[PDB]
Structures are given as C-alpha cells and as structure tokens.
Chains A and B, each alone.
Chain A
C-alpha cells in the first residue's frame, strides 16, 4: 500500500495524456495524477461517467486525506480502495458510480504518413473545386440547350403561318434558305449534345477518381493515428 506501487498513480501528467488515454475505453475508468498546483501533494483522481471526465481532488489537512469535511480517512490509498469497493453516492448521490476499470501501465513513419496526408488533403481540396466548376459548366450547357430549344419552338409557333403561306405561294428560294438554316441548326445542336455527353463522361470518370481518393485518405488516416499514438507512448 504505497503511492508509487499504486496502479492508479501516474505522477505529474498533463491533461493531454490523461484525455488521450481516456478514449476507446468503457465507462468507469480512473487514474490518479499529481496536482498541477504542486503544493504538499494534493493529488487528483479522474472519473469518466457519461462520456464526460470528472476531476476529483483529494483534500489534505492536519496529516489526513479526504474528499471533504469531515476528515476521517488516513491515507489516499485507503480512500481510493474504499470508494473502489463502494459507491460514491454516499456523500453526493449525483455521482453514484462504482470504480471498475483502472488505468494500467502498458521513426520516419510519422513524418512520411503526415506528408501523404497533407498531399492527399491538398489534392482533395483542389479536386472538389474543379468538380464544382465542371458541374456548373454542365448545368450551363443544359440550360443553354433548353433555351435554344424553347426559342426554336416559339420561332416555329410564330412563323408557321408565314412559312405555309410562302411555300403555298410558289416560292422556292425561301424553301432552300429554310432548309439551309435547319441543317445548320441541327448540326450545331448535335455538336453541343455530343460535347455535353463527352463532358458528362469525363465528370463520371473524375467522380470515380474523387471517390477513390477519399477512400485512400480514409484508409490511410487510421495508420497515421496509430503511428502518432505509438510515438507519443514511446517518447512521453
């Protein structure tokens, strides 16, 4: 029964390591670390409950350790075991939790993986912009095709009577000019439609590439996370 031999004791540890270790763990996880103030060893326990971590401070007065008055507990380990084997609702019913799981004790890859992560992020953010631009271009082409079609429809609706009168009069050069204009318009429409189809095919290929790139990013990120965790464990 000593502070150093205690498994929950962790010494002077900042919140970053505490909150990194208190992840991917079940409810009811605890560890004890030295108080940040560093005065006559106040110490501090952690208590995860409902996701949130609650920070407990062990008061010490007149050679005696306890959460609060009344002060009737001799050592820190005594109180820690007492509330490990008994619920914390005796004083404050809100906590009403049992200590079950303790925190038990137990290079170019990181830089490389961060490099590909950054390059994939840059490629992704450029590809998203170019995809948006291509989508806008395709929408513009569709809108202008619709506008041309409706203009042709209203032109025919407005000029059908005059066309019929001219063709019934006996004129032929008007028929030839109408045929020429109709052929030119049909060729232009066919060219625009073919261009739109090719652009749609290119957009499909580029969207497939975008999907593959994001899948690569999401597959690679966990490896970088694990490598960073390993490096942090080894160094600090």
Chain B
C-alpha cells in the first residue's frame, strides 16, 4: 500500500479484491505515481505468523489461511515453494531462521547438500529415472520362489490376462512364472527385434512393472498365485505415463550459496562439574521436603562411574554453585559420553525431571563454560531415576525447569583424538562358549567370565561376526586403551546381516563409530523391500541419536528421495509425530528438507494432507449425519488423490450415501471411493477405508509388520499357512487409515443373523470340489493365527475381532495391545465353535486325523518361529524410545523369550507350549510327541 490508505462476499478470488482496490485508488488521490500492476505483489501475514505473498488464483482468499483481514502491496517461485512446504509440514518454515542455536543453522545448510545429491540421482537417467521414481516396484523380499512349493502352478506355469482398451479386448496367456515381461509383451502382441518395454499397470491401481526380472516376485502377482485369483494386467504405452508427470527440478534455497596436535588425552584432571542452580523446579514446597540432583556419565545404559549426587536442600531456593567430582578421569571419557541429569525427590527416590547434556558437541569439542539448559518432563510410566535412553540436546520449549551449570576451564583447545593416532598407534610403541553366546538372544544374561573370554579372545570373534553386539555390552567404555582397541576392532569388523546390523542401532550402542558401522551395513545390505518393511524402525532410531546431523539421516533422506513409495511412507512416519516436541525440531527440519527436494510430488502430499486435514476437522465434529456434510468444499477436496495407505490407490469420486457409520463405541469413517481407473471392474468396483481418530495405531502397524514377517518365514520354510497382513498407516496423533478386505465376515455377525452356526455357514457358502479346499485353508489360517497370537501374547479378543473369508481364510483385527500390559499367557481361548468346524461336524475330536494334522502343523509353525526369534527380538528392541507404554524398556521384551521359551531346550519349549494351551482350554492337549 504505497499510499497507505486502508478501507474495510470478499472471500472470493483475489481478482475481486484487486478490482475493489483499483476502484478505491481511482476514487482517491495519491495514485498518480503508481507503476504497472504487474510490478506490485500482494503480501500479508498468514495464520502461521509468516509474511507471504499470494499468486494462487485457483484457491480463493479463504484458502490463504489468513488470520486477519488486511493486505499490503509491495525469486517468486522460491517463496511460493516455501509456502507450499509450510503447508506440507503443518507449521511455519521461516520461524526456524530465527533460531540462535548454531547447530540448527548448520544442519539446515548441510542437509540441502544431501537433498542435492538425492535429486541429482533421481534425475540420473532421464526420462526413465523419475519414471521409476514416481511408481516404484512393489517387489517381494525373496527374488526367487521356493523350489518345493511351486507345485501350486499348473505344470509350473501361470495364466494371466492382458487387456487393451480401445474405447476392451482381453488376451489370456500361460507363461512361466520365472520369465521377464519382455516375453509377456512379445506373446501379447500375437494371437490377434520388437524390443517393447511398455508399462503394464495392475488393473485398478497404480502398480507398474518396470524391472527386467521375472513377473512372479511382485507382491501382487505372488498374491494372485497363492490365492488362486486371476491376475489381470492392462497395457499402456510410455507416452501417457511420461506425460502424466510434467517434470520438476530442485532449486537451491536462500541459505545455500552462502559460505603436533593437542587433544583431550593430554589433560591430567578430573571430571568435576559445577552445578550452580536451577532457575525453577515445579515441585511443591511443603509436600516434598528433600530434593537433589542426580548426574551420571552414561554411555548407553551403562553408568561409566557411580552416579555422583548433590547434597539435599530445602525447596526454598535451589542454588548450590557446587563442584561435584565424578570418579572418572577426563582423558578416559568416551566420544559419546552423556551427562544424564535429573532433579529428583527422596522421602525415605523418584525423579522430578530429566535431561541430557552431551559431553562433546558436533564440532568434537568438549563442553566448557556457563551453560543453562531446560529439562523435559518425566516420560510416562518410567520408574527409573534417570533416562539414559531419552532424547538428546536442549529443550526448545522455554517455560520448563531450567538448570544452570558451569564446566571446567582449561584455556586451551579440547578435541577428541583423530582416528589417525589410533591407526598408527603401532609400529612405534573352546569355541563352544562363543557359539552358544552368539546364538543366544541379545536380551539374555551375560557373565563376566564369558565377558572376559570375549575380551581376551576378541581376535577369535572375527570368525563369528554375529557376536558383535555381545562384545559391546562386555567392555568397559571408561578406559582409553580398551576403547581404542574396540575402535580398532569396529574399524575392520566385517559387515553383518541387515538384522544383526540393525541391532547395532538400538538405544544401547551410542558410540558414533558403532552406529556409523551399523548404518553403513544397513545402506549396503538392506533392500528396498526390506527397507519398506522396516522403515518404522529406521525412523524410530532417529530419536536415540545425539546431534541433528548424523549418518542415519544421510541414509534415510537419500533413500526417501529415490523411492516415491518409501519416500511417501518416510514423509508420513515423520509427520505422524510432530506433536511430540522432543524431536519436533529435528523431524521438522528433516521434513522441510524432504518437502524442498521431494519435487512436484509435494502438491500431491498437500492434497493428501488437505484431505486428511478436512477429515481431521470432520472427525472432530463427530463425538442426521449426511445433510450436515453437504458443502462443496469436501467434494472438491476429498477426490482425485492418492491414498496414504497406498500411493497407487486413487480415492476417486465419493459416494456420500453409500458410506455409512455404525456406533462400535468410537466412530471411525467407513468411507468408500470409486476407482477412477478406466477398467477398475476386474479388481474392485470400490475402495473402502476406515479412517480412525482418537486411537493410536503404531502398535497395530508393528503387529501387522511382525505378522507379515512370520507369514513370509512360514511360506519360506514350507508351511502354506497364509495370513492376512493387510494395510494400515497412522498419519498423526492417534489418527490413521485401515484397509478393508474383500468378502469377509465377522463370526459375531454370522452368529447373530444365522451351536453349529459357523459350520452351517461354511457348508452353505459352497458345494462340491471347492469344499475340501475351504476346510484345508481354514485349517491353515487357524493354525497360523493361533501360533501367532500365542507367541506375541496378543490380549483379550472376542468373536467380533475374528473374520472369515469366502475362500476359507480366517484372520484377526483390532489388536488392542500385545506383549501384555502387566498390571494369563493366552487368554484368547479357542472356543469349540471352531472345533466343530475343524472336525467337519463330528462331536468327537480326538479320533479325528484332521485334528492331528492341525496339531502337528501348529507345532511345526511354532518351532519354525522359535528358530528365527532373534529377528523379532531385535525388532522389539529398536522401538523402545517410540513412546508406547508397553515398549519402554528391555524388561518388556522378555515376554518374547518367555513364551518362546528361549531359556529351555526345544523339547522343553514343546511341553511348555502344550502345558500353556492345556491350561487355556481346560484339557485336550499335552499329547504324545511326534
């Protein structure tokens, strides 16, 4: 507003406001010196405390997210993209440019480099590069099918249907499952040197076949083979898919182009820390009379020295200015030492706050000076006095208890020694126990006898690499010589499996070189499918790290900007926990980097976010239902976007009257979207998704993750006990999406609207040759799910949580909790309602050979899982700092080894299994072995 005049429906497009302003300027003086309208830009303050301009004509004033009705008149794409990023992360971006912490700005400058290499690799082989990006293959973990269960194929060949749309001809062809799509297309041409490489989208969803590999190993074709369904494929040319994406490029932001030895081993002093005062501690004065501060030089869960405590003082004024000496030498400190501190209260032993102060910094310089840090609140249900596994760094929130400290003054340069001095330190200065400990689970007990055997025969541990997580819990990290030797070991340690290495990223291995080795092994040997399966854990290991930058984000961000599905799930996993302020800053910076380098896909996310935003608002008014939801806003918003559950499911035109909501205590959104595919008829007419709000879903995601892992292992070994690990994804604070499967019914509905009711229903569903197959499939599913629900200790369930398919499969939902809530191993109880079905209606069950086959197949599945339980142990260990009250500390993972009976032997575990399920059923178990 160069003239400064202000005048005050108007929620239309900005053209109306521009015309009104021009009319006012023509009606009043001082407008003679105004320049061309194209040289003036409308800028104002949005609801997110950001000065931003407005070039978007498609969205009106009401979509600008303004808080007050005012407008001012003053590269463009740069801050347009900045506004888009701010929308895509839900919080203002430029608000981080005012942070006075040099670590934040250093990370912001440095992560853009990683974004640059990621997008450069994303645009390495144009135009095919971002083509493979935008729709990445959904392959299976196993490249090759098992050699002994390919008999499901008729003469080792699979029949498929290829469709051509002319605006609709199908071609049914039989091909070997280990054949590349080249021959698929070559023989598709016939029946109606030509090196065609055109896309074959799954009819009804955006899965595409690009790899020069066989057709069977895709997660969709394999499902069709195992389920017996007819695989239908439809042919496009390259031009349509290439013209679908209008191309995008990454640009450098504003802060992009802007540009002997002395060490810590030559100090002879003691780690003495001056605790000056706490600015304010939120503890009652008369109620609590004895408080103090506990500090420990932790390294993992290990207090390197005894936690030195301060004197107890009245709560009137907590000023000490007191030097506390810790029984630890300065040069013996490790690179990852952490002053874990907490104000605590004693009566006559419970903390009042907690916090961690790094004993170094990202510049590898020892902490030194006057240092006032705020403290986090006590985590829920954490009985331990300290929190060595908690988040690192400062508390960004300001209205929290703040402690003042002073650190020793040396008037020199403090730096942890370079690897060179340790490297050239030299040149101038039976196996039964090893195998038993290596094969033993990581959570197990350890003794100093075997610890000393490990340390003494460390040179023999290289032949057995899986022992690497065993040495670390053995060595004492407060000794420069032993730690130097361990660094030398880590440097030349051979890589281990992407699950054993993935064990080396827990909350118990904080050494920067150890976690660097673990992340290097991950990026070297983890596969895109395995990365997709374990992305939840790989995001949960960010919170354990000390600094904003680390080798972990260097890998996660590089992968999430090369695979659009992996990147989409990385986006949603990050964004799902913005509410937790502990890692809000770190993940918001990572989110800004992603949203800057994601590309055009950004707006897709925005659409998705927008939709969920509406739903989050819509689900907010749900606490006589369709008439209220009639504004064109949500028809315009809730259409034509990829689902978060799948970057391939276009949630198309909504059928408002079709979607109805039942009570079921809490009220989700059973929302059905039509499929906008030209021939969505073959796969599904519809796409139904349950939108849950108010309940957490991370534990359900983990449950489905481990269920799919178990099912894949069972398929690999030779037990065709097919599970139903459907899709689920939490999108924020206790809100998410759940898939709904095809042709499935809960047992309670059958009983209510239909005691042999289940048997009668399974009988009347089908007749003839497709009967015995139904009973066989029901047997397999029940056995697999019973073994699963016993091993993981899934809590109380009713008939409602159980559904049965038409073909015969049975499956479970509504995992309220698992691994118990502490203050009854298998209280689920298998009722005889299924026992009559498995016996084919016979009253007797003992004299049935089918029940014997069921029992032995259950036993084989259980003993198959018990020999792979190490992977599950590591998986449970990784997500400890993930915030679930049932996955806090390692003592909650014993439920995995208790039920799997890892302490006992195979046979003893067997009788434990039969005893448990015998106590469950009041009889009918503990039969003859084999």
Contacts and interface: CB of A to CB of B under 8 A. Distances in A.
Given A16-B894, A147-B72, A218 B283 contact: yes
A186 interface: no
A53 to B, nearest CB: 10
A24 to B, nearest CB: 5
Interface in A191-236: 207, 210-211, 214-215, 217-219, 221-222, 225, 228, 231
A219 B449 contact: no
A218 B378 contact: yes
B303 interface: yes
A219 B378 CA distance: 12
B303 A52 contact: yes
Most B CB contacts (10 A, CB to CB) among A117, A132, A143, A151 go to: A151
Contacts of B635: none
B48 A125 contact: no
B447 interface: yes
A214 B448 contact: no
Contact of A225 (B29, B296, B383, B452): B383
Given A14-B894, A210-B399, A185 B6 contact: yes
A51 interface: yes
A176 interface: no
Interface string B441-462: 0000111110010000000000
Interface string B774-792: 0000000000000000000
Contacts of A16: 891, 894
Contacts of B287: 219
A155 interface: yes
Contacts of A67: 449
Contacts of A128: 397, 581
A190 interface: no
Contact of B579 (A51, A125, A207): A125
A57 interface: yes
B282 A56 contact: no
A106 interface: no
B894 A15 contact: yes
Nearest to B347: A222
A139 B377 CA distance: 24
A132 B585 CA distance: 13
A100 interface: no
Given A51-B307, A155-B3, A222 B448 contact: no
Contacts of A71: none
B378 A151 contact: no
A108 to B, nearest CB: 12
B48 A15 contact: no
B830 to A, nearest CB: 28
Interface string B1-36: 111111000000000000000000000011000000
A219 B352 CA distance: 8
A199 to B, nearest CB: 12
B68 A144 contact: yes
A85 interface: no
Interface string A125-154: 100110110001101100110011001100
Contacts of B823: 110, 228, 231
B806 interface: no
Nearest to A163: B30
Nearest to B401: A214
B3 A56 contact: no
Which applies to chain B's interface (DSSP): helix, strand, loop or mixed?
A: loop
Contact of B581 (A132, A139, A181, A219): A132
A140 B45 contact: yes
B242 interface: no
B296 A51 contact: yes
Interface string B276-312: 0000001110011000000010000011111100000
B914 interface: no
Contacts of B283: 215, 218-219
A214 B445 CA distance: 38
Interface string B881-917: 0000000000100100000000100000000000000
Nearest to A26: B306
A143 B49 contact: yes
Contact of A211 (B282, B306, B397, B449): B282
Contacts of B307: 51
Contacts of A222: 345, 347, 349-350
A23 B350 CA distance: 11
A151 B68 contact: no
A58 B217 CA distance: 53
Interface size, A (range): 35 or more
Contacts of B67: 137, 140
B380 interface: yes
Nearest to B280: A211
A52 B307 CA distance: 11
B384 to A, nearest CB: 8
A101 interface: no
Given A144-B45, A159-B4, A50 B284 contact: no
A2 interface: no
A68 B449 contact: yes
B47 A140 contact: yes
Contact of A181 (B5, B305, B350, B381): B5
A92 interface: yes
Contact of B282 (A36, A143, A148, A214): A214
A56 B302 contact: no
A83 interface: no
A144 to B, nearest CB: 5
Contact of A147 (B51, B304, B581): B51
Contacts of A23: 385
Interface in A17-34: 19, 23-24, 27
A55 interface: yes
B288 A140 contact: no
Interface in B249-272: none
Most A CB contacts (10 A, CB to CB) among B47, B51, B350 go to: B350
A125 B581 CA distance: 10
B48 A50 contact: no
Nearest to B381: A117
B378 A155 contact: no
A219 B448 contact: no
A15 B891 contact: yes
Contacts of B302: 51-52
Contacts of A162: 30
A138 to B, nearest CB: 9
A101 to B, nearest CB: 15
Given A16-B894, A136-B49, A27 B284 contact: no
Interface in B313-354: 345, 347, 349-350, 352-353
A208 to B, nearest CB: 10
A50 B306 contact: yes
25 contacts: A15-B894, A24-B349, A44-B447, A51-B305, A51-B306, A55-B445, A55-B446, A55-B447, A117-B381, A137-B49, A144-B45, A144-B70, A151-B1, A151-B72, A155-B4, A158-B4, A159-B3, A159-B30, A174-B29, A184-B6, A214-B377, A215-B282, A217-B377, A222-B345, A228-B383
Given A16-B894, A222-B345, 13 more contacts: A24-B349, A51-B302, A51-B307, A55-B448, A67-B449, A68-B449, A129-B579, A136-B92, A137-B49, A155-B4, A159-B4, A207-B399, A222-B349
Interface of B: 1-6, 29-30, 45, 47-49, 51, 67-68, 70, 72, 92, 95, 282-284, 287-288, 296, 302-307, 345, 347, 349-350, 352-353, 377-378, 380-381, 383, 385, 397, 399, 445-449, 452, 579, 581, 823, 891, 894, 903
**Shortest Cβ-Cβ A-B pairs, 4 listed:** A155-B4, A51-B303, A140-B49, A222-B350
Interface of A: 14-16, 19, 23-24, 27, 36-37, 44, 50-52, 54-57, 67-68, 92, 94-95, 110, 117-118, 121, 124-125, 128-129, 131-132, 136-137, 139-140, 143-144, 147-148, 151-152, 155-156, 158-159, 162, 174, 181, 184-185, 207, 210-211, 214-215, 217-219, 221-222, 225, 228, 231
